[PDB]
Design an enzyme around this catalytic site. Structure first.
Site, PDB file in Angstrom:
ATOM      1  CG  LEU A   1       7.941  31.730  -6.024  1.00  0.00           C
ATOM      2  CD1 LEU A   1       7.868  31.529  -4.400  1.00  0.00           C
ATOM      3  CD2 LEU A   1       8.377  32.901  -6.601  1.00  0.00           C
ATOM      4  CG  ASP A   2      14.270  29.875 -10.494  1.00  0.00           C
ATOM      5  OD1 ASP A   2      14.207  28.686 -10.934  1.00  0.00           O
ATOM      6  OD2 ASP A   2      15.266  30.753 -10.392  1.00  0.00           O
TER       7      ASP A   2
END
Ligand code: CDL
Ligand code: CDL
Lengths: 164, 166, 68, 88, 66, 60, 54, 37, 118, 109, 171, 459, 37, 112
Positions: D42-43
């Protein structure tokens, strides 16, 4: 108006604490939520007290504020105070509209895990007695006030119809 | 101080002020989504100076988006709590002397507490040795407190076992 | 938890000093209050009349109250 | 009173719960050990979002410096565990 | 202690029947009262504020200037 | 000796000691004298702290 | 009986204070000075000669 | 707003019913003559 | 305000009202209506500027309060009675507003212009 | 008329509590806050009587008790001024504080 | 039982109660009951204390002070006479103080008695008030911290001379 | 009066000959037993000031101040212990002896009829204090602030003797009674200038007016707590006292001569009242406070209205107990952590939950709280000064606001806001501390019932 | 979640001033039945 | 106040300011950080003693060379002060006038 005000705003705080502590405590008008979510009696207190402090439609404090703006609406006031009265009381009403349109209006938005509780004889008895009294107290104070002056009581059009 | 926490902070408190802006939380949503795109097109360029530049532009353009009473959750410094209870925090070095009567008022606490007094009275030599060993000259570079290798306590523990919030 | 262990500064010295202080202030308070009560009751305060003719009034008794 | 504490079971159920409500990744792999980035990729800006809305779940603290490096869920549970008053 | 307060996460907070009973009762009190005495009151309470029609009173007309 | 004797005892002493500065006597005497002043018709409180009937004045 | 014992808790002040005033008022010339009771022409002699408007 | 008021200070609002047709009109002191018949 | 009276009466203030009539005195056409005895008017103590004509009504209302004490409502009628009498009176001062405004217009205009003809 | 002497009772009915809050130092642990509340109500009814007496007959009597020092030409004592400002106000104050104190028993538990 | 004509109590002029409407008796239940509960239970005690006092009487006297030549007959110095003069001057002074207190209290009780009538029935007493307080004002008013006789006699010299010039300009 | 002079002089050998460990018991005991008869001293009545013996007498003012002194010894001495509580016996008996002898010369001074006996006993009062604070003052560098302190006194304090002896041989007797009745007006000119200025400034050095106020702070930070309660509870009231009496003469002069000093005290009241707001090191705050109230006193002295005296003396006594006590709080806080610096520690609402009540109570009594004697005196003084100038209330009431601000600021940041948690020393209270505080406040609150004792000769 | 539930029906304002009107001026409707019968 | 310009920090200022700054800091953090058992009294830190001693006005007794100093102080106690001298003497003398002549309308004044 001091006596009546004491009843009404004391009501308003002593309910706002039910809101706050019931919510955990955020005490910001942002977040908050809607009116009736397991909060019947506190919100009732908030439209008794809000609707009250609006200047009243016909209710108790009306016996103060409306008479006040009637007599002050007339005679020798330097007249910069009349508009003052008008927009003043109006923005009081709009305070009320604020706290309803935020605290009592939209579906609940706030930190989750509802902890809210209204159930306890201390609050309900408190706010209870204060509102039962409030609506009936201003009425006793109403016509037990041995007359101290000549009320206007002859009130011209457009200088009468502007209170409510 | 690095580009990482700079950008990420501006993003975070930008979301905060945006929270404080709107109401009913949905408009907050898709606005926050337009912002999500506004930083989402970003970050794909490793060009150096162009980036910090555009960031600063977001520093002014952000600074416009501050209304004076941003929402503050209660526990941090802010108009709700930030140690409402602070008169209730009594440090454990108090009660080191109560009257031996009241020291007998609660007979079994000071048992375990005495096991602590011995825990950390037996200690601190192991501590001072480990620390005086590890520290580079002056201990300038490290604000941290690295653990203990042998079986036992983590050396600068005493204050870090605290009177808890209420 | 069930019951946390509260931490208070101490209870013994404050409460002790108060117990003592009350003890003494009362210790000579009660006899004196009782006295003022009695001489207020059984002995009368006083009454005026006026200076008799050719009479030498004493030093005291120019004053109403007996403790005076 | 404000009676209910957050216990270990509870907070676990909560971080776990909301992370299962996060849509862009699936409930497929979610575990206190299951890596909060390397697994899901995930970012990092998106972990800033996770800590954002999770703070808005529990409503307190979480300074930016400590929020930066959080990662794995068990760890988040830990930070909330010492910051709040949790253990038996 | 526990009152059966039922601390709840994400569902509608449970509510005591008697409570909404009370609140509704006092709603009926407020409006029952207010329109009650609104039927017992008036917002124009006396004879109306006067009019210039008597400002003629043309009998008053000036004597010396016909 | 500090709390018992002086505070309580002394506080009763100076609580009511004989009339201090004479002001109670001043009240009584004032009452009598005023009553006399009205009952005999003289205006009370004549100013002039000393009778001009006996006094002399310098001259230019 | 308990509420009558608290009614004593209020009543003893009535005993003392009221006693303090029963000897007090007489002992000192000016105190408890009250507004002369409102007198109406209904009492004594009334002069009106009124009637009307409707 | 205040100094605007003090400009309203010497000027006035009046009692009844309405205001500022004004020529040299009356104001409260009740002025000239008295007669009817 | 019908007469100047005199200060040799030893009376400043309400024993000297503006005169015994509170407001105007109405030389005008005819007199001023009836009377309310000043002594009674004092022995039921009435605040100044509460003290006018129509007291025929007022003092009866002050009766009606102590008439039936536990009743809160008591007389709404006498309340409306001095409400009515002083209604009519304030309307009278309205009529004085009228009389004088029109006297202004009439003698101002007529006498100014028709005086300015020649 | 001396029921207004009961009006100068009610003030000491309020005076009562702090004396309990000091001298005994134990039974306060028995939940006196309830006790304070009860004292407030006692002051509310015992304070309610004089209002009624006034609103029939008026009769406002000021009391000087025992005078405060003397000094020169002005002897200032102390008083309790029944103006119908006091008569009407004090039941309101005691009443609202009745509320706020019970509520506080809920708030500070 | 204070001396009456010093402290006037006007006629009590109590009105006659008229029920005028048939209702409950809200205070009178409790004025009778009060006069049952708080009247006798105290009255017995005050009366008992009375007889207890009365079984043994006291007599205490209001002191007197004779007169003296005061300031006039004292020579410019030789204090031995002066001391008497000026100190009794101080006594009579405090006496005048308490006179001012008496009048000043009559005024207060006057307004409280009248009620809304404030300027009706206090005119006489306020008048004699301005009389007395103008006397005190004229005589003792401005002297200072250190005052005995010499300064009061002094001021009286001052007024006598100022009014002697005033009465030569009276011509 | 001699019946009060012997018992302390006998209280000297009581100290000197005694078994070790009983010195505090014997001294405290018999000293309070003195205080009883000090309370006997009030016969004062009517008009003539009582006269015990042709050598020395008492009017009112001397009686309250004296009662305060003889009351203050046992509490002082009671407080001074545990400042040391370790030494050779000779140090203890020397110190108590010195406090005694000091009290003796104080009683001499207040009771003294004749102004030269007043003056001899005056500097004879100053010496013992000097020995106290210098011989052991905790001596921060010692500052040499006892000795050239005595030079601050004598520098201009000697010539008042000159002026006196002049008054002596011109008029004969310096007896105060006969100086009264023989006082004769002195016109305004240059000789009466240097004279009035001599006596005035001579006493005005003691109660510091804003010009000279540098006198107090150092001398009072270097003082051991006994020497502090000596100093600022009494040794200023000597200057203001003698001022009260010698203003008997100088009748017209004090107007044209007064005006500049009045100005300086009305402005310096505000200035000092300001500088005491911002400082650290708590021991100074109460000092400059003393400077403020004493400036107010001088203002009260020069304007001669009787109100001015009543409020004045009331302020002497009330400020005596208040300032004294508040010092003793500073000390009781100092034994806990060795600082003298205010901001260093904090908290003590949590800890020492009782000592709160004495901090609060005392600070309020210096806040001018309405029933407190401090507000009686300050109030009457404000009345007098407003009578003198309709304008001055801006400055006066401005002192009301500032005195409120610092007086209530001291109540915080020592006593509130957090525990600094690196302390871990302070030992909860004592019974002795509570005894000292109590012995201060309890009379100051009782006097707020029957004040007519402490109001001045004119009453 | 903040939407779905017993929520989401909510109330529009002036409904707050319509909260209890039904029973309230119901009993208002009956109220005059005392003096009319 | 108002963080702005978002300084680029360059290179030296980075290395120097960072390393040296947090160098001395962490040195002193760890310094007072010892916090062992067995210390009964205060931690005594030499900080804030410098605060106290300097704020005791170390240069007060020495001298005050002129520069602008005597102007700032003299004019600092000059304008308002001496003018207040003039106004209290003014209103003084006026009060004395209206007392000695005409009327101040004191009437009853008495206690003064
Ligand atoms: C642990 C409990 C602590 C309680 C603390 C106090 C709490 C407040 C309530 C107190 C209630 C009880 C009071 C005493 C009982 C008698 C009352 C009475 O009959 O009054 C009318 C009664 C009237 O009778 P009277 O003899 O015809 O009148 C004389 C005048 O009052 C003479 O005129 P006056 O101008 O002097 O007026 C008297 C006035 C004013 O007196 C003063 O201001 C005295 C000032 C002394 C200064 C000393 C300085 C030393 C350095 O004092 C009072 O009214 C009493 C308040 C002060 C009490 C001090 C107690 C010790 C501390 O009052 C007096 O006689 C006064 C009595 C003398 C004063 C001291 C009395 C108290 C002795 C110690 C009692 C301690 C409390 C006991 C426990 C109570 C709770 C369990
Ligand atoms: C009302 C009349 C008009 C007043 C006008 C001004 C109102 C506001 C005043 C300022 C705030 C007062 C306050 O509450 O401060 C907090 C202060 C301490 O509260 P705290 O520190 O938060 O809590 C205590 C501890 O946490 C834990 O300690 P504790 O709970 O175990 O014990 C509490 C209590 C335990 O008691 C004792 O230690 C025994 C004291 C024996 C005194 C014997 C004489 O007090 C203490 O331990 C130390 C404080 C007492 C020192 C001595 C008396 C100071 C009186 C201060 C003025 C009166 C304020 C309340 C008046 C209420 C009406 C009577 O409380 C008081 O000052 C109340 C004192 C109550 C005891 C004496 C009652 C009768 C005294 C005679 C009549 C006094 C009239 C005074 C007129 C005004 C003079 C300035």
């Amino acid at each position: 108006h001091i006596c009546t005000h004491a009843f009404f705003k004391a009501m308003l705080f002593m309910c706002s604490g039910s809101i706050i502590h019931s919510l955990n405590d955020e005490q910001d008008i942002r977040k908050m939520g809607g009116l009736f979510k397991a909060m019947p009696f506190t919100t009732t207190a908030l439209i008794i007290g809000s609707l009250a402090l609006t200047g009243m439609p016909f209710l108790t404090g009306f016996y103060s504020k409306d008479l006040i703006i009637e007599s002050a609406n007339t005679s020798y006031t330097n007249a910069w105070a009349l508009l003052m009265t008008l927009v003043a009381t109006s923005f009081t009403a709009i305070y009320s509209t604020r706290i309803i349109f935020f605290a009592l209006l939209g579906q609940p938005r706030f930190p989750t895990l509802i902890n809210i509780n209204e159930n306890n004889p201390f609050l309900i008895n408190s706010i209870k007695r204060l509102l039962i009294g409030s609506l009936f107290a201003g009425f006793i104070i109403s016509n037990n006030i041995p007359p101290m002056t000549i009320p206007q009581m002859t009130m011209p059009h457009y200088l009468k119809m502007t209170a409510l | 101080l690095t580009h990482q926490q700079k950008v990420l902070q501006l993003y975070k408190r930008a979301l905060r002020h945006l929270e404080s802006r709107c109401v009913h939380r949905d408009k907050y949503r898709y606005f926050a989504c337009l912002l999500r795109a506004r930083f989402d097109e970003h970050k794909n360029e490793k060009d150096m100076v162009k980036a910090t530049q555009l960031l600063r532009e977001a520093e002014k353009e952000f600074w416009h988006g501050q209304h004076p009473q941003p929402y503050i959750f209660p526990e941090s410094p802010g108009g709700t709590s930030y140690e409402r209870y602070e008169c209730y925090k009594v440090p454990e070095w108090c009660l080191d002397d109560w009257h031996p009567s009241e020291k007998a008022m609660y007979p079994d606490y000071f048992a375990k507490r005495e096991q602590w007094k011995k825990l950390r009275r037996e200690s601190w030599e192991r501590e001072v040795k480990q620390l005086q060993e590890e520290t580079p000259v002056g201990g300038p570079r490290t604000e941290a407190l690295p653990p203990a290798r042998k079986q036992g306590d983590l050396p600068p523990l005493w204050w870090h076992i605290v009177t808890r919030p209420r | 938890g069930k019951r946390l262990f509260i931490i208070k500064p101490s209870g013994f010295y404050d409460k002790r000093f108060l117990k003592l202080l009350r003890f003494y202030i009362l210790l000579t308070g009660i006899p004196v209050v009782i006295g003022i009560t009695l001489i207020n009751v059984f002995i009368g305060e006083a009454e005026l009349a006026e200076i008799p003719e050719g009479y030498v009034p004493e030093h005291w008794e120019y004053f109403k109250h007996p403790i005076s | 009173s404000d009676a209910p504490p957050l216990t270990l079971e509870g907070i676990k159920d909560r971080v776990l719960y909301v992370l299962k409500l996060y849509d862009k990744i699936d409930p497929e792999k979610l575990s206190v050990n299951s890596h909060f980035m390397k697994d899901l990729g995930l970012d990092s800006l998106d972990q800033v979002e996770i800590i954002m809305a999770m703070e808005d779940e529990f409503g307190f603290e979480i300074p930016d410096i400590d929020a930066e490096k959080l990662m794995c869920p068990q760890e988040i549970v830990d930070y909330i565990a010492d910051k709040k008053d949790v253990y038996e | 202690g526990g009152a059966h307060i039922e601390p709840r996460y994400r569902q509608f907070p449970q509510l005591t029947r008697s409570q909404v009973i009370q609140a509704e009762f006092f709603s009926a009190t407020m409006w029952f009262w207010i329109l009650w005495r609104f039927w017992h009151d008036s917002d124009a309470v006396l004879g109306h504020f006067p009019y210039p029609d008597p400002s003629q009173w043309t009998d008053e007309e000036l004597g010396i200037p016909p | 000796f500090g709390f018992s004797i002086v505070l309580v005892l002394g506080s009763t002493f100076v609580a009511y000691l004989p009339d201090y500065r004479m002001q109670e006597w001043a009240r009584r005497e004032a009452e009598r004298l005023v009553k006399y002043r009205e009952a005999h018709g003289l205006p009370l409180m004549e100013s002039n702290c000393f009778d001009p009937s006996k006094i002399q004045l310098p001259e230019d | 009986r308990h509420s009558i014992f608290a009614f004593t808790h209020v009543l003893i002040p009535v005993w003392i204070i009221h006693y303090y005033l029963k000897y007090h008022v007489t002992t000192k010339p000016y105190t408890i000075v009250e507004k002369k009771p409102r007198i109406f022409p209904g009492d004594t002699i009334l002069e009106t000669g009124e009637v009307i408007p409707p | 707003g205040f100094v605007a008021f003090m400009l309203f200070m010497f000027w006035v609002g009046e009692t009844y019913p309405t205001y500022q047709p004004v020529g040299p009109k009356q104001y409260p002191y009740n002025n000239l003559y008295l007669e009817r018949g | 305000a019908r007469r100047y009276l005199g200060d040799a009466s030893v009376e400043p203030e309400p024993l000297r009202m503006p005169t015994f009539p509170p407001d105007y005195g109405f030389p005008e056409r005819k007199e001023r209506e009836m009377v309310a005895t000043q002594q009674e008017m004092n022995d039921a103590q009435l605040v100044l500027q509460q003290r006018d004509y129509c007291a025929h009504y007022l003092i009866r209302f002050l009766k009606c309060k102590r008439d039936s004490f536990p009743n809160f409502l008591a007389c709404k009628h006498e309340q409306h009675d001095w409400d009515y009498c002083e209604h009519l009176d304030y309307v009278k001062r309205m009529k004085e507003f009228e009389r004088e405004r029109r006297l202004l217009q009439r003698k101002k205009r007529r006498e100014q212009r028709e005086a300015d003809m020649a | 008329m001396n029921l207004f002497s009961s009006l100068t009772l009610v003030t000491l009915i309020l005076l009562t509590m702090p004396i309990a809050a000091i001298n005994f130092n134990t039974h306060k642990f028995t939940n006196y806050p309830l006790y304070v509340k009860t004292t407030i109500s006692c002051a509310f009814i015992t304070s309610m009587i004089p209002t009624m007496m006034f609103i029939h007959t008026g009769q406002e009597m000021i009391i000087s008790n025992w005078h405060w020092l003397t000094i020169q030409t002005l002897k200032l004592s102390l008083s309790f001024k029944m103006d119908f400002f006091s008569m009407m106000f004090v039941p309101v104050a005691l009443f609202v504080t009745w509320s706020i104190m019970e509520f506080s028993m809920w708030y500070m538990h | 039982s204070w001396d009456k004509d010093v402290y006037p109590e006007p006629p009590r002029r109590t009105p006659a109660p008229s029920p005028q409407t048939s209702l409950p008796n809200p205070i009178t239940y409790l004025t009778k009951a009060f006069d049952l509960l708080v009247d006798r239970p105290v009255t017995l005690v005050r009366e008992f204390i009375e007889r207890q006092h009365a079984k043994n009487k006291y007599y205490y006297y209001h002191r007197e002070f004779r007169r003296v030549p005061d300031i006039t007959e004292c020579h410019e110095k030789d204090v031995l006479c002066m001391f008497e003069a000026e100190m009794q001057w101080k006594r009579d002074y405090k006496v005048d103080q308490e006179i001012v207190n008496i009048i000043q209290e009559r005024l207060k009780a006057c307004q409280q008695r009248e009620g809304e009538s404030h300027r009706q029935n206090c005119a006489k007493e306020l008048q004699q008030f301005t009389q007395v307080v103008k006397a005190y004002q004229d005589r003792y008013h401005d002297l200072g911290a250190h005052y005995s006789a010499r300064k009061c006699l002094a001021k009286q010299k001052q007024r006598m001379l100022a009014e002697r010039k005033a009465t030569k300009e009276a011509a | 009066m001699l019946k009060y002079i012997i018992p302390t002089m006998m209280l000297m050998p009581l100290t000197w000959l005694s078994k070790n460990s009983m010195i505090w018991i014997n001294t405290t005991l018999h000293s309070l037993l003195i205080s009883l008869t000090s309370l006997l001293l009030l016969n004062q009545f009517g008009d003539n000031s009582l006269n015990f013996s042709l050598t020395f007498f008492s009017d009112s003012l001397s009686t309250p101040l004296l009662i305060l002194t003889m009351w203050l010894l046992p509490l002082m001495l009671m407080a001074s212990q545990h400042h040391l509580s370790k030494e050779n016996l000779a140090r203890k008996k020397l110190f108590i002896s010195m406090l005694i002898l000091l009290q003796l010369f104080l009683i001499m001074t207040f009771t003294a009829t004749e102004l030269i006996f007043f003056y001899i006993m005056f500097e004879a009062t100053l010496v013992p204090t000097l020995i106290i604070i210098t011989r052991w003052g905790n001596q921060t560098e010692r500052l040499n602030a006892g000795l050239y302190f005595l030079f601050y006194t004598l520098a201009g304090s000697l010539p008042l003797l000159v002026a006196l002896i002049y008054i002596q041989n011109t008029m004969g007797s310096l007896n105060f009674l006969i100086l009264q009745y023989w006082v004769q007006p002195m016109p305004n000119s240059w000789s009466n200038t240097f004279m009035w200025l001599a006596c005035m400034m001579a006493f005005m050095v003691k109660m510091p007016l804003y010009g000279l106020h540098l006198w107090l702070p150092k001398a009072h930070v270097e003082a051991p707590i006994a020497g502090s309660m000596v100093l600022a509870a009494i040794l200023l009231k000597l200057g203001g006292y003698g001022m009260m009496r010698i203003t008997l003469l100088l009748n017209p002069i004090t107007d044209f001569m007064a005006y500049p000093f009045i100005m300086l005290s009305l402005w310096g009241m505000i200035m000092t009242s300001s500088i005491c707001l911002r400082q650290t090191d708590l021991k100074s705050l109460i000092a400059y406070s003393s400077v403020s109230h004493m400036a107010l006193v001088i203002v009260a002295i020069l304007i001669q209205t009787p109100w001015s005296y009543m409020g004045a003396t009331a302020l002497m006594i009330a400020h005596g107990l208040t300032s004294s006590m508040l010092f003793c709080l500073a000390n009781s806080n100092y034994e806990r952590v060795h600082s003298r610096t205010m901001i260093l520690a904090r908290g003590l609402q949590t800890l020492l939950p009782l000592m709160a009540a004495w901090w609060l109570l005392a600070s309020l009594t210096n806040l001018a709280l309405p029933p407190s004697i401090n507000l009686i005196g300050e109030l009457f003084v404000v009345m007098s000064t407003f009578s003198w100038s309709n304008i001055t209330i801006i400055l006066m009431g401005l002192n009301m606001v500032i005195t409120a601000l610092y007086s209530l600021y001291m109540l915080i940041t020592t006593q509130r806001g957090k525990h600094t948690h690196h302390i871990n020393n302070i030992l909860p209270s004592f019974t002795r501390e509570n005894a000292l505080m109590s012995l201060h406040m309890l009379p100051l609150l009782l006097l707020s019932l029957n004040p007519k004792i402490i109001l001045g000769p004119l009453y | 979640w903040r939407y779905m539930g017993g929520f989401a029906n909510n109330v529009s304002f002036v409904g707050a001033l319509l909260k209890g009107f039904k029973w309230g001026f119901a009993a208002f409707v009956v109220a005059v039945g005392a003096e009319y019968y | 106040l108002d963080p702005a310009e978002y300084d680029i920090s360059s290179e030296t200022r980075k290395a120097q300011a960072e390393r040296l700054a947090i160098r001395s800091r962490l040195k002193r953090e760890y310094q007072l950080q010892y916090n062992d058992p067995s210390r009964r009294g205060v931690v005594e830190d030499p900080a804030l003693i410098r605060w106290t001693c300097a704020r005791s006005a170390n240069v007060y007794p020495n001298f005050r060379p002129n520069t602008k100093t005597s102007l700032l102080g003299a004019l600092f106690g000059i304008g308002p002060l001496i003018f207040w001298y003039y106004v209290f003497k003014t209103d003084r003398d006026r009060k004395e006038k209206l007392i000695q002549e005409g009327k101040l309308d004191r009437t009853f004044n008495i206690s003064y």
